[PDB]
Amino acid sequence: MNWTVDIPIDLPPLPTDLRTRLDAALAKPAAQQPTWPADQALAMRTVLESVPPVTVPSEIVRLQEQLAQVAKGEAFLLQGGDCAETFMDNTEPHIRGNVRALLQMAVVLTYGASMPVVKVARIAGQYAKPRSADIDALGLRSYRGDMINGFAPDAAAREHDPSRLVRAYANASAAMNLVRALTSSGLASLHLVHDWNREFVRTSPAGARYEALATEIDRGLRFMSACGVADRNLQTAEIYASHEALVLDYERAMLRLSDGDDGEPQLFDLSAHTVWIGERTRQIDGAHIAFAQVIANPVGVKLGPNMTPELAVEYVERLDPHNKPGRLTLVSRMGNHKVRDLLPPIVEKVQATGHQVIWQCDPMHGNTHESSTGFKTRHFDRIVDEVQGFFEVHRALGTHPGGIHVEITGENVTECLGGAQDISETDLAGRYETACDPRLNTQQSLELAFLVAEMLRD
Amino acid sequence: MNWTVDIPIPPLPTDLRTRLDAALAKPAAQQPTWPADQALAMRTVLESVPPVTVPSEIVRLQEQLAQVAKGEAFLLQGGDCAETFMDNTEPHIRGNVRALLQMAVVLTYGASMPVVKVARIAGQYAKPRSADIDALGLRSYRGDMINGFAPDAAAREHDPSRLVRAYANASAAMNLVRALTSSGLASLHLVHDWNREFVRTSPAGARYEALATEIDRGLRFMSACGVADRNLQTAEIYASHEALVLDYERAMLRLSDGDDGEPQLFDLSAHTVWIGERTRQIDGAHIAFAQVIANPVGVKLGPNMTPELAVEYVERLDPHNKPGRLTLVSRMGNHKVRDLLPPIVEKVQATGHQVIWQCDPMHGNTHESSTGFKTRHFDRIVDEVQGFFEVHRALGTHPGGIHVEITGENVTECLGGAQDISETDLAGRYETACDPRLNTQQSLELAFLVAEMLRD
Amino acid sequence: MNWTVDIPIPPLPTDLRTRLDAALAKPAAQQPTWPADQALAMRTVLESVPPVTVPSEIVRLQEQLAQVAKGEAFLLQGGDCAETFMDNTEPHIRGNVRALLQMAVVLTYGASMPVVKVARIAGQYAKPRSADIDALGLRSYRGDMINGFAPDAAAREHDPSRLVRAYANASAAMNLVRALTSSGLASLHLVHDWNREFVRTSPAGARYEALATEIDRGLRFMSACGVADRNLQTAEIYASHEALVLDYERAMLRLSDGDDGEPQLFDLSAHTVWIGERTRQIDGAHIAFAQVIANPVGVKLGPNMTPELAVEYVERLDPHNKPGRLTLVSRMGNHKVRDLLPPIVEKVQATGHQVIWQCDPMHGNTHESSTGFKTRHFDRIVDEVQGFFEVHRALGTHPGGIHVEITGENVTECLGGAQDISETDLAGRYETACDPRLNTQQSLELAFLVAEMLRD
Amino acid sequence: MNWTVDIPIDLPPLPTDLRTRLDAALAKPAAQQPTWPADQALAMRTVLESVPPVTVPSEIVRLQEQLAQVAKGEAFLLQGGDCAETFMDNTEPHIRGNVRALLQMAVVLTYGASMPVVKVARIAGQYAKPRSADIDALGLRSYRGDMINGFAPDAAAREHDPSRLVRAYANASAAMNLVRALTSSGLASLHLVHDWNREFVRTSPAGARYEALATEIDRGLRFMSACGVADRNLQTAEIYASHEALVLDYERAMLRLSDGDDGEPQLFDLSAHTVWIGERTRQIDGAHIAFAQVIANPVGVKLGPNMTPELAVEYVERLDPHNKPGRLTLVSRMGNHKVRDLLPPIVEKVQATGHQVIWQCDPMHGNTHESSTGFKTRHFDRIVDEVQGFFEVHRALGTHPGGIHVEITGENVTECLGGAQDISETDLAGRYETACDPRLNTQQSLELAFLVAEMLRD
Ligand SMILES: N[C@H](Cc1c[nH]c2ccccc12)C(=O)O
Ligand SMILES: N[C@H](Cc1c[nH]c2ccccc12)C(=O)O
Ligand SMILES: N[C@H](Cc1c[nH]c2ccccc12)C(=O)O
Ligand SMILES: N[C@H](Cc1c[nH]c2ccccc12)C(=O)O
Ligand SMILES: N[C@H](Cc1c[nH]c2ccccc12)C(=O)O
Ligand SMILES: N[C@H](Cc1c[nH]c2ccccc12)C(=O)O
Ligand SMILES: N[C@H](Cc1c[nH]c2ccccc12)C(=O)O
Ligand SMILES: N[C@H](Cc1c[nH]c2ccccc12)C(=O)O
Ligand SMILES: [Mn+2]
Ligand SMILES: [Mn+2]
Ligand SMILES: [Mn+2]
Ligand SMILES: [Mn+2]
């Protein structure tokens, strides 16, 4: 009839002082919010206020410690996953593939950087997106991600449905459960992950190019074993969860109070470990920035080509008022043709504040174009070149190129042009599967890690 | 108040399909009565969801249960009698995880060997009933996977959407159990501090002070010897429930890769499951389903168990003689266990198979109070574990573990303990959706008492 | 019966040469009387030999002694009163190492904190004498570094070749101590098994059974919690002796590299040394020598110690306020310790320096038996440690350690203990070349008793 | 007067059954023995029978386990030190230097081999040597090593002096004490040792040649740390002690019985962990081979160019009668011009026995010549080439090139020609300090390790 099933829905409030501060923050204007009825939103938030959290505060405190090391130039941040997760594709094979692809990158980057890599997935919550246009090319209300409405090009599917708040949480908690299982039970074994990398080198069209570094890494691993390193710390990995904090109904409902066995109680957003604010919602006096101000999680802000040095400093002063290294990550996405010019005066001005942000490169979102064959796509070479320029900016300034933020999948999709597979405009039509932006496929994402490893090694 | 999910629009190896079909074609007791087409829709949803557990965890559990079977570890299994969707919250889950960990510390010290920790959690949403009409003249409550606790006819109708609600709640609970155990709740030193606070405040804490202090001095000894808090920071808590609703269990089957031997069916709704008294028909679907899955399994054994039938369970469910694959869960009643258990243990031991012998001291010791509550006396619960130990000591066999129903809540559900919970007291916080649980103090007191059994 | 060694045919920093010269120019008590030119030849040999210890070990010991001084570890120091060349054998060295380890296990459990293990070994070859003529009318025996034990005049002549014989024996003993401690003698589980055998066979083993079993259950708990035998397989035993013969100690000085701060003189005849009652003249060469070397040092404090003099030792020997650099070693007599120690501890604590307070319960409790033997009563030895603990408990200060004279041999040298060694018994195996030692059973019994003091 | 000092000398016997077997073995003829009086030898043996052992049996059992792994192709044996230790040069700086030089080699070989390296020093007992001629070029009785007589060209010094048995033990136990201290207290820290290697690359004349591999190793080490390997297993190293078992008075006096907490009591030679029998004393029916037969230690036999395949098999049958992998090491020293020809039929015949020996290359003792300027010397290139040929023999046969046995020192001596320093015949006169054969100096020994690492990597 509909080919759906309906699932029926049937504790103490947050402290009054923290709620008072939250309410003053959320009184600010919020861009890009769903347009569902307030009373229905309230009902769904009330459901979510009672569910088990996706993450817990001690994990977020640990992440914060590891991100402080990144900010101080003593680790590197890898952040990667789908552009937009869908409920339909939130499956074991797909989750496992994206976790594998992230781990494979991390091995190569760890060796290249000669320092720890903090692994943060875009996963278990990346279900909401902004739109510039409220009507899409089919004359429909725009798809806004599965937390808000449906991808299917159908008017009914596109109506904003607050029950998707609860479907999002179910999907997020189920995905996170599996990410925890996979990372603690042997998928994330260093030797197993490297074996996958060896197979990539064996079969890639440009594997000859990456053979030398792959063999080095292999000889590094075998050296560890030769020296009598026990495989204990090598058996499991930590993968943290992240998404864009966009739908404030969801994020506010997933706020919890820490139990104060750590230093004192505060608000954590336990929908994720770390979240970032996007280019379309980072209004300095808007609700998203004010929400980020109130929560204890590490946070990031996207910085595009219109960014000024002065506005960047404002973000730093609002979001890192206590000068905690790693609390704030500034995520540059300029375009490969602009990054070398636009980034330096922003970095200089922010460095002069005495604060220590993480400088992270997003080489995807500034390098998107439309193909002749009608697909939204990005060229691999432009993605690579923005990271190259980003490294050059930091090397010239003596600052730390702190990490990358990429959109990838373990699927063999045909979404970005180029790479060693030499994906063409024609090829795009084969497996163009993204519900939003074009992702690096599993080979392209690994090839990028090898290339960035060589940047790190210089 | 509906959320809504879409019904999704590589085949099993032929032999596994054949064997699964044959198992599920056998008669199955205690199944919900809902329409086949609606059940199919829900199963098709569940066949696509992320699993609650993964096969490598289950293989690890099997290794650790083999050590139990060989007399080199002890099995602690505990949690709610029935999880509810309403009470599937962070505080409640944290409390039950804490209560299990607290027990495990005391039992680990008492046993002088590792304790395998298995929660009744993230799936324990279905129960059998002897009668389909209850004392109020309603269709019986069968757990939140099947129908609703509320005493009205509409709530008690069997609703297949509860299959998917059960999974949602299970996966969210399991996520949190993983987080809590890897991120410091399960720190050995933190858990023991809770035990010290119990001794401080219990009415019979004087009784348990000496052993508590011994444990404390054992922990400090580790630190004194330069043991780093690496192995001590985190714990493994496995998930278990009664495999009852075969619509749910069959939909949560996944095929392993052939990285370990050959491809097998794992039930990834849990790490380990057990078959109950009312569904363990030797030629029934539940026992046959258990034969087809790779998980470690248990079978409840009540007072009508024969030595010969016990051997037949062993031979059907442990056909490859894999130590720890099968757990036999005695629940006899404290007045019967000493008499009924020995000839069952003797006969099974003579097979050359190595089962885990596990004591369930709850389900054989239930009575109704004057004040109308289903309850159990603490002293009878303790005494069945005592008798169980005596049976094994006399035979030279391994008293392998306990299976108890507990909660971290301060409920008033079982009589007695050091709090001396009375029939009157029961009315205060009788919160269980099914059987009476040991509250958090009673569960810890039981662990101290069983530690003293282990030490003798 | 001579082996023969050749006299070997970068200058100190000027300030260290100046300070060493000034120290050694001060008056030195209790020195051998042998010709300067012969002493010089021997020192020149010793200036070229491989050191018994190395500076990084001494820096590590200093770190571990700082933890003792801060109340976070306990110091066990024990071995022969006087090592002899004749008894410097594998069995004897192994026995004394075993006896020290056995004590350390019990004390570690009792203290609930790490025990720093320091043997009187690999150098303890020289002793002071109050009288230069002994009861037989001979020149007194002064230890094998100086002259011979045999009661005849020729053997008692001071012989500087014994300097080099002492080093040879020391370095050979230290080699073996290193081998034994890294290669399984010092395995925690093996050492505890020896303790279990003692409880099995001692006449008062019933008395110590409960604590022995507690310790056993503590060890098994570690294993149960999945502690790997990595940290448990090996132990560190440091070497110590009284720094008495300044010809020997000065020849065994080596200059550190400047990898840790600046170059310093280390005495590499040992890890730590102490200055005795008869050589601790505040303006004498021994105290000045101790000021110049980087090793942790101790000073013996007897019944005539004032609080003011104790403070002067602290200020001279710990001028930089480095916790654990100085150990003050109380030896008062069991009848005096409670009275004499408190005002010394109070005054020193008020300085803001953190010394190690260590009990030597032997040297203040020596008497002569009817049957002619120098002996000590076990009960008086125990009682001085008891009083020492009482002094510290009353003051809120740290009873930091003990310094005892023990052997792994079944000798008959100290009266009493559970064996009830009598005056008659003494004649059986009175084997010490100087003071009466606790035998292997008495030394272990003492550790059990001091563990109970630690537990109160 | 003499410029010496005299040191005066002042327990249950070994079991009667073991002594009976020992006496039957030592009844055999023994070559190259000192000629001191029997009654004086007996007195000195009686002294030594009572001294603390240099090594203990549990260490030797552990070595045997690690050598079994070498024999099975899963580890590599490095054995190195002075040709002849002297008492005069048995000092802290010299011992420390030789330990450092061995460790430096081991790091490079571990990385190159991608498997553990068993580190065995020629040290703490290498005090005795054979001679072909009983009169030397000065018309004196030949120097036979400090255990027997004195190096000084003086008739009195050259008389065989049994008190040197006890001086040898004193020196051995003092050296071993220090080797234990150094290896457990931070000299043997992996990172510290590698830093020395970095400094060598910085300053060697051919450091450009070895820079790439040095940097690889550095990046391997930093990878370990990046992956969160704790520096516990990396802080200390095991260095075992070895010498040629030549003077049977010494070796027999240092026999001890194991305490039988291991499987059963037997005779261990506790003067060392492992000993070998030389080319001049390996008579198949001689006392040295029979002594090696009776002791439990791992043992080696030198095989020179006159070796037959049949005699090699005889050694295997006498010395490894229980087919214990690693118990026997066969140490080829052929000459670089002969090894490729002479070794293969020996390896083939021995492999066919079903026994697993360690095949170890001694590239020194077959490659010695006299310079025009009068010095006994070896060319670096010939030393390297014999190891090269040795590897080629094993690669062709599918057998395991199991290790090397070299004569090295941490001193900057001028004893072997060539290397990157290009040591000439003229240069030899500068620091020719060996009491017997020419050693690789500290730079040459490290350069050899780099070159053999490249052999391992092929
Ligand atoms: N693909 C998902 C299926 C899903 C994930 N978590 C839950 C929880 C409860 C029911 C279904 C699911 C979906 O379409 O939501
Ligand atoms: N486990 C040690 C690691 C090590 C420590 N120092 C060194 C020096 C050279 C090689 C290795 C090591 C080992 O592999 O022996
Ligand atoms: N206690 C839960 C609340 C809830 C609603 N949807 C989900 C999804 C996943 C976990 C929990 C929940 C209930 O009433 O079902
Ligand atoms: N880390 C060691 C543990 C140990 C090993 N053997 C012994 C013997 C006695 C006491 C302790 C130990 C240590 O704590 O010294
Ligand atoms: N007990 C020793 C035996 C001995 C003789 N020379 C040495 C050298 C090193 C150690 C011991 C010995 C003694 O009588 O001196
Ligand atoms: N390896 C863990 C140690 C541990 C950590 N937390 C707890 C709580 C209760 C018992 C033990 C542990 C283990 O033994 O399970
Ligand atoms: N160079 C050494 C010095 C030596 C080494 N060990 C001992 C023991 C006793 C006396 C001297 C030495 C030598 O010439 O023997
Ligand atoms: N301690 C882990 C090591 C590790 C395990 N799996 C992976 C995968 C990719 C990189 C590293 C690791 C860590 O460094 O995160
Ligand atoms: Mn995107
Ligand atoms: Mn129940
Ligand atoms: Mn004394
Ligand atoms: Mn040589």
Q: Can you spell out the DSSP letters for A145-198? A: -TTTS-SSS-HHHHS--TTHHHHHHHHHHHHHHHHHHHHHHTTT-HHHHHHHHH
Query: By C-alpha distance, which of A44, A146, A125 is closest to B2?
Result: A44
Please, which residues have CB within 8 angstroms of residue A148's CB and are 6 or more apart in sequence?
Answer: A34, A128, A160, A161, A164, A247
Please, which residues have CB within 8 angstroms of residue D290's CB and are 6 or more apart in sequence?
Answer: D25, D26, D28
Q: Which of D111, D226, D230 sits opposite A223 (nearest CB)?
A: D111
Residue B326 and residue B355: Cα distance in Å, rounded? 5
Ligand 6: residue whose CA is nearest its atom 14? C225
Question: Environment class of residue C195 by beta-carbon count within 10 Å: exposed (0-12), middle (13-18) or buried (19+)?
Answer: buried
Tokens, residue C380: 């008086």
Other CB atoms closer than 10 Å to residue B2's CB: what's the count? Answer: 12
CB D306 within 8 A of CB D330: no
CB D38 within 8 A of CB D256: no
Tokens, residue D213: 């591999």
SS3 A269: strand
| Exposure on the CB side of residue B37, measured as CA atoms within 13 A | 3
Scored b (16 or more CB within 10 A) or e, A178-216 reads bbbbbbbbbbbbbeebbeebeebbeebeebeebeebbeb
Which H helix or E strand runs over A111?
Answer: helix A92-113
CB C449 within 8 A of CB C381: no
Give this entry's resolution in angstroms. 2.0
Other CB atoms closer than 10 Å to residue C205's CB: what's the count? Answer: 18
- Give the per-residue SS3 of chain C: CEEEEECCCCCCCHHHHHHHHHHHHCCCCCCCCCCHHHHHHHHHHHCCCCCCCCHHHHHHHHHHHHHHHCCCCEEEEEECCCCCCCCCCHHHHHHHHHHHHHHHHHHHHHHCCCEEEEEECCCCCCCCCCCCECCCCCECCCCCCCCCCCCCCHHHCCCCHHHHHHHHHHHHHHHHHHHHHHCCCCCHHHHHHHHHHHHHHCCCHHHHHHHHHHHHHHHHHHHHCCCCCCCCCCCCEEEEEECCCHHHHHHCEEECCCCCCCCCEEECCCCEEEECCCCCCCCCHHHHHHHHECCCEEEEECCCCCHHHHHHHHHHHCCCCCCCCEEEEECCCCCCHHHHHHHHHHHHHCCCCCCEEEECCCCCCCEECCCCCEECEHHHHHHHHHHHHHHHHHHCCCCCEEEEEECCCCCCCCEECCCCECCCHHHCCCCCCCCCCECHHHHHHHHHHHHHHHHC
D170 touches ligand 5 (CB under 6 Å): yes
CB B292 within 8 A of CB B265: yes
Q: What's the distance, Cα to Cα, between the start and end of chain B in Å?
A: 56
Ligand 5: residue whose CA is nearest its atom 6? D166
Tokens, residue B196: 């010290």
Residue B29 and residue B287: Cα distance in Å, rounded? 11
Give the alpha-carbon dihedral of D208, D209, D212, D215, to 10 degrees: -60
D193 touches ligand 2 (CB under 6 Å): yes
Other CB atoms closer than 10 Å to residue A16's CB: what's the count? Answer: 8
Nearest-atom number in ligand 1 for the CA of B6 is 14
**CA C397 to ligand 1 centroid distance, Å:** 63
Query: By C-alpha distance, which of B177, B118, B127 is closest to B295?
Result: B118
Region for residue B396 given its phi and psi (left: phi exceeds 0; alpha: psi -120 to 50; beta: otherwise): left
Ligand 1: residue whose CA is nearest its atom 13? A87
SS3 A377: strand
Scored b (16 or more CB within 10 A) or e, D293-315 reads ebbbbbbbbbbbbebebebbbeb
Other CB atoms closer than 10 Å to residue A308's CB: what's the count? Answer: 13
Distances from the Cα of D309 to the Cα of C180, D148, D350, D360, angstroms: 42, 34, 7, 16
Packing angle, helices D164-185 and C55-69, rounded to 10 = 50
C266 touches ligand 7 (CB under 6 Å): no
Q: Where are the strands (E) in D115-226, listed by range? A: 117-122
Ligand 7: residue whose CA is nearest its atom 13? D87
Partners of A34 in beta bridges: none
Q: Which of C224, C226, C232 sits opposite B225 (nearest CB)?
A: C232
Which H helix or E strand runs over D160?
Answer: none
Question: Environment class of residue B137 by beta-carbon count within 10 Å: exposed (0-12), middle (13-18) or buried (19+)?
Answer: exposed
Tokens, residue C50: 């491989």
SS3 D167: helix
SS3 A452: helix
Query: By C-alpha distance, which of A316, A283, A296 is closest to A130?
Result: A283
3-state helix, strand, coil in chain B (%, to 5): 45, 15, 45
Q: Which residues of chain A does D228 touch, with a Cβ-Cβ cutoff of 8 Å?
A: 116, 233
- Experimental technique: X-ray
Residue A118 and residue A112: Cα distance in Å, rounded? 14
Residue A90 and residue A122: Cα distance in Å, rounded? 13
Chain centroid offset of residue A149 CA: 21
DSSP per-residue letters across A181-250: HHHHHTTT-HHHHHHHHHHHHHHSTTHHHHHHHHHHHHHHHHHHHHTT--TTTTT---EEEEEE---HHH
Residue C101 and residue C68: Cα distance in Å, rounded? 18
DSSP B427: G
Measured at the alpha carbon of residue D35, what is the angle toward residues D33 and D41, in degrees to the nearest 5? 90
CA distance C221 to chain B (A): 5
Tokens, residue C268: 């590499």
Tokens, residue C432: 């010490």
CA distance B372 to chain A (A): 28
CB C148 within 8 A of CB C155: yes
Handedness of CA D423, D424, D430, D431 (dihedral sign): positive
Distances from the Cα of A113 to the Cα of A151, A191, A193, A387, D364, angstroms: 39, 18, 18, 14, 42
> With an 8 Å Cβ cutoff, are D174 and C176 in contact?
no
Residue C430 and residue C447: Cα distance in Å, rounded? 22
Q: Where are the alpha helices (DSSP H) in B33-138?
A: 36-46, 55-69, 90-111
> With an 8 Å Cβ cutoff, are B3 and A7 in contact?
yes
Chain centroid offset of residue D291 CA: 18
Residue of B nearest to A92 (CA): B50
CB C333 within 8 A of CB C387: no
CB B134 within 8 A of CB C244: no
Residue B146 and residue B32: Cα distance in Å, rounded? 6
CA distance B340 to chain C (A): 32
Partners of C398 in beta bridges: none
> For chain D, how many residues are written?
458
| Exposure on the CB side of residue D408, measured as CA atoms within 13 A | 32
Nearest-atom number in ligand 7 for the CA of D88 is 1
Neighbours of chain A (3+ CB pairs under 8 A): B, D
CA distance A190 to chain B (A): 16
Please, which residues have CB within 8 angstroms of residue D416's CB and are 6 or more apart in sequence?
Answer: D377, D378, D379, D380, D383, D423, D438, D439, D440, D441, D444
Q: What's the distance, Cα to Cα, between the start and end of chain A in Å?
A: 61
Residue A30 and residue B174: Cα distance in Å, rounded? 34
CB B127 within 8 A of CB B143: yes
Question: Environment class of residue A377 by beta-carbon count within 10 Å: exposed (0-12), middle (13-18) or buried (19+)?
Answer: buried
Q: Where are the strands (E) in A38-183, listed by range? A: 76-81, 117-122
Handedness of CA D191, D197, D199, D201 (dihedral sign): negative
Q: Which of A110, A219, A226 sits opposite D227 (nearest CB)?
A: A110
Handedness of CA D290, D292, D296, D299 (dihedral sign): negative
Residue to substitute in D65, D184, D190 for testing ligand 2 pocket (most ligand atoms within 8 angstroms of CB): D190
CB D102 within 8 A of CB D409: no
Residue B49 and residue B171: Cα distance in Å, rounded? 10
Query: By C-alpha distance, which of D178, D181, D253, D191 is closest to D218?
Result: D191
At residue D67, φ and ψ (nearest 5 deg) are -75, -30
Query: By C-alpha distance, which of D86, D114, D73, D152 is closest to D325?
Result: D73
CB B454 within 8 A of CB B393: no
Residue A77 and residue C142: Cα distance in Å, rounded? 69
Residue A259 and residue A270: Cα distance in Å, rounded? 13
At residue C267, φ and ψ (nearest 5 deg) are -85, 105
Residue D98 and residue B274: Cα distance in Å, rounded? 65
At residue D315, φ and ψ (nearest 5 deg) are -55, -45
CB B215 within 8 A of CB B106: yes
D110 touches ligand 2 (CB under 6 Å): yes
Among the bound ligands, the one closest to the CA of A333? 9
Handedness of CA C86, C89, C95, C101 (dihedral sign): positive
Query: By C-alpha distance, which of A393, A364, A405, A406 is closest to A455?
Result: A393
Q: How many helices (H) and strands (E) does chain D have?
A: 14, 13
Residue A435 and residue A421: Cα distance in Å, rounded? 22
Please, which residues have CB within 8 angstroms of residue D312's CB and are 6 or more apart in sequence?
Answer: D303, D330, D346, D349, D350
Residue of D nearest to C8 (CA): D88
| Exposure on the CB side of residue A8, measured as CA atoms within 13 A | 14
A18 touches ligand 8 (CB under 6 Å): no
Query: By C-alpha distance, which of A135, A403, A401, A144 is closest to A280?
Result: A144
**CA A164 to ligand 3 centroid distance, Å:** 13
User: Looking only at Cα atoms, what is the longest distance across chain D?
Assistant: 64
Q: Which residues of chain B does C64 touch, with a Cβ-Cβ cutoff of 8 Å?
A: none
Output Rg (C-alpha) for chain A, integer angstroms. 21
| Exposure on the CB side of residue A202, measured as CA atoms within 13 A | 6
Enumerate residues preceding breaks in chain B (C to N > 2.5 Å). Answer: 9
Q: What's the distance, Cα to Cα, between the start and end of chain D in Å?
A: 61
Residue C42 and residue C248: Cα distance in Å, rounded? 9
Region for residue B79 given its phi and psi (left: phi exceeds 0; alpha: psi -120 to 50; beta: otherwise): left
CB B385 within 8 A of CB B402: yes
Q: Which residues of chain B does C108 touch, with a Cβ-Cβ cutoff of 8 Å?
A: 221, 224-225
Q: Where are the strands (E) in A342-397, listed by range? A: 358-361, 368-370, 376-378
Distances from the Cα of A331 to the Cα of A319, A350, A381, angstroms: 14, 13, 20
Chain centroid offset of residue D378 CA: 18
DSSP B140: P
CB C219 within 8 A of CB C227: no
Query: By C-alpha distance, which of C73, C74, C78, C75 is closest to C442?
Result: C78
Partners of A163 in beta bridges: none
Around ion ligand 9, residues with a beta carbon closer than 5 Å are A 83, 437
Please, which residues have CB within 8 angstroms of residue B375's CB and are 6 or more apart in sequence?
Answer: B366, B367, B368, B369, B413, B414, B415, B423, B426, B436
Tokens 């021994």 found at: C286
Q: Which residues of chain C does B215 touch, with a Cβ-Cβ cutoff of 8 Å?
A: 221
Q: Which of C108, C223, C231 sits opposite B221 (nearest CB)?
A: C108
Query: By C-alpha distance, which of A232, A142, A221 is closest to A184?
Result: A232
> With an 8 Å Cβ cutoff, are D223 and A117 in contact?
no
Partners of A302 in beta bridges: A331
> With an 8 Å Cβ cutoff, are C254 and D92 in contact?
yes
Nearest-atom number in ligand 5 for the CA of C3 is 6
Residue A315 and residue A349: Cα distance in Å, rounded? 12
**CA C78 to ligand 11 centroid distance, Å:** 11
| Exposure on the CB side of residue B101, measured as CA atoms within 13 A | 28
